[PDB]
Design a protein around this ligand. Sequence first.
Ligand SMILES: Cc1ncc(COP(=O)(O)O)c(CN)c1O
Ligand SMILES: O=C([O-])CC(=O)C(=O)O
Lengths: 401, 401
Amino acid sequence: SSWWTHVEMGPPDPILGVTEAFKRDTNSKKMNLGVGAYRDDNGKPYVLPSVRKAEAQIAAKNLDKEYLPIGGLAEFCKASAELALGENNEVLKSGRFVTVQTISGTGALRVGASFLQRFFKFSRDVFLPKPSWGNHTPIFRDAGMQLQGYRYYDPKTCGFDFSGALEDISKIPEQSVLLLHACAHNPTGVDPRPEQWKEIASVVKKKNLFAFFDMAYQGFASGDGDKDAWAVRHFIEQGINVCLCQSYAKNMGLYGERVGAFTVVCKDAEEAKRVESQLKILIRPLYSNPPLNGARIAATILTSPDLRKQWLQEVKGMADRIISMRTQLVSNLKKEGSSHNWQHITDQIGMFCFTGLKPEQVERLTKEFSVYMTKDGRISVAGVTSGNVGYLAHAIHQVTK
Amino acid sequence: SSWWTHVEMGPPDPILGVTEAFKRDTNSKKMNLGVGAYRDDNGKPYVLPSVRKAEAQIAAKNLDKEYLPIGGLAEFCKASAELALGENNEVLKSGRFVTVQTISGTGALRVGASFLQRFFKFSRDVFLPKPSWGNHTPIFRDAGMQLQGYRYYDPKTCGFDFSGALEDISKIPEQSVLLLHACAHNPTGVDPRPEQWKEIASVVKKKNLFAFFDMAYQGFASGDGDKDAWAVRHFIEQGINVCLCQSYAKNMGLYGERVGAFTVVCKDAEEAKRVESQLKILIRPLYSNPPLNGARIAATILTSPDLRKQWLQEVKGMADRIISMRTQLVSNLKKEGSSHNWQHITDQIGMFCFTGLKPEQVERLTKEFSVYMTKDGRISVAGVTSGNVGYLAHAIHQVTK
Ligand SMILES: Cc1ncc(COP(=O)(O)O)c(CN)c1O
Ligand SMILES: O=C([O-])CC(=O)C(=O)O
């Protein structure tokens, strides 16, 4: 007597649970360290002025709203590949890549997954770091791939378990897919060092693996676009034919406009044309064609030397404000008398920090102090202000003294 | 070798072929009847003045670009359901529905299809009219459903094969899914009349079929949104709990902004809460959350009485331009001395029209007249103007007399 009587209610959203638990809390000193987007020194959302200026120029052009090609705005695709690999990359010069516009980084992930499902005949397995972005798991499963793990986060140190990572990678059957965060690993903030990368690169090429890069933070991570894109470029120069998911949600503040690109580096231009045609064939039955607004903004910024330069410094200020909060947190933890090693909070990169806090300590931070955060010890460094970091260092010490 | 040596070049897009060949032609009398979007009486893109006003007003509010919920803009969702169902539908008053924002119409079809695949345990079969929108097949297929057909187009009359349709549907296995175009069937332009819809409804309800409405053209079809949604409303009024895909591509000319919605009509609000949570769970691994810009524009128009009233005159405008083209096309065929019955051109509805022309006649139209269209005889009425309709009728009469 109904189509949907057996449809069950989903598990609740832990990250949304906390974000609502915070709005309810009435104490004026409450912090939300669960928020998944950049906030300014006052905890407000931040629309980059280069973005505002791009919108101004765009509006002036009085443009139409006609469909994009299936692969999106050609000029955004070219600029985006350029941002990822550097303008004079051997790959761009010979044309041996295809880049399609996607529905932010998630859509690039899903389009990427769907492409492996269909054309990566060698294996069903996708190896994620332990842990990874939560959504990585259902994206690859819903798309029809098998998930696996390799060691990454060393809880003992709150940094990279280089050696476990490496043993694990050497043991991946050949021609399996390996997923890598290009920088600012999410949720932990723990990234390999350049020398560590070269070694993963070595095994990957040795053991004949497929390197799938997720790059959500180029520039936002360290302030330096080239540094943040270094591992990806290094794999390519090593002769590894990567694919790559870019997001402009964070580094341009374009979250809700859903601006992303998926790229596949190929042996040659003719191969890229074959791959391109099949990405179009997968994309059409997902959503036909991608949205105009974000991509017009990002294209306008990237292809204007002035605006590009200005945006690039606006990114540095975001990256910096975050770094500042990391350094200032450790500072005030010392200044408060704490004894344990907090260098991991500043060794980590990007806006997510695995603190080391265990769950009970997390719960006491919520109860006694109104500091909201996931039981895994992850905080949004974007929730920290200069105005509140002091209080936070006090509170963290209390549950940990 | 390479990861991708076995990846085949995909087949050429035929609609894009027609459109590119049209663009190469240097014949000054050329016509593009392959175009997949509205054009004005000079053959130009048309941004509704209400859309410009809505945009201006949004810009004036200096809004953020933060992430929408997985289900999109709450107020766009509400207004979208009210548009489809009529503001005082008992479905709205009891709250027995869920509506989520999607990546336009295509996105609503894909989300619905994944939901069927995962939850509609009663069937793997989706019945499409013959013919149907080409993308319907890969949509449901990539989502893991199977496709079947029922007789719809009647090639003898270029009309609706009512008795064939009614018979076929009356023999669909109970509890299969039945896809129906709400109005302005694409590609034929052939619609059932109200009385015919009552009979279909009565057979769906007899056989316990699940009705899946694609509604890409409310208001755009006839200029009257209440009449265009009548079938959908009638089905619901008869106790059929439909799902529904909406697009704002054509009726608001938001094509490239990708604004659509998927609705499930449910037994009660409680069931709608359950269905909602599982639509969310399927949306996340697709694209996380939908684009903001078009949804803001649509919510703004729908919830302001002045903008809504203006928008409704603009839709009527487009619909009447299309009806006008249809009428003058038949009229001029008669002035040319054609003796074929051409009333199908005026009986059909919307911007796509099955002319009745054979492939060879289509070839002659392309070669000798530079009139560009697909070989199935389909023309896009949007490419017809006051300027060229006389010419079109002359060409059609030349190749058919
Ligand atoms: C590693 C990673 N990959 C993918 C995403 C998804 O980004 P987007 O919002 O552009 O889909 C994010 C941002 N949450 C991320 O941090
Ligand atoms: O490009 C699209 O979304 C499809 C379309 O209008 C058609 O050809 O009928």
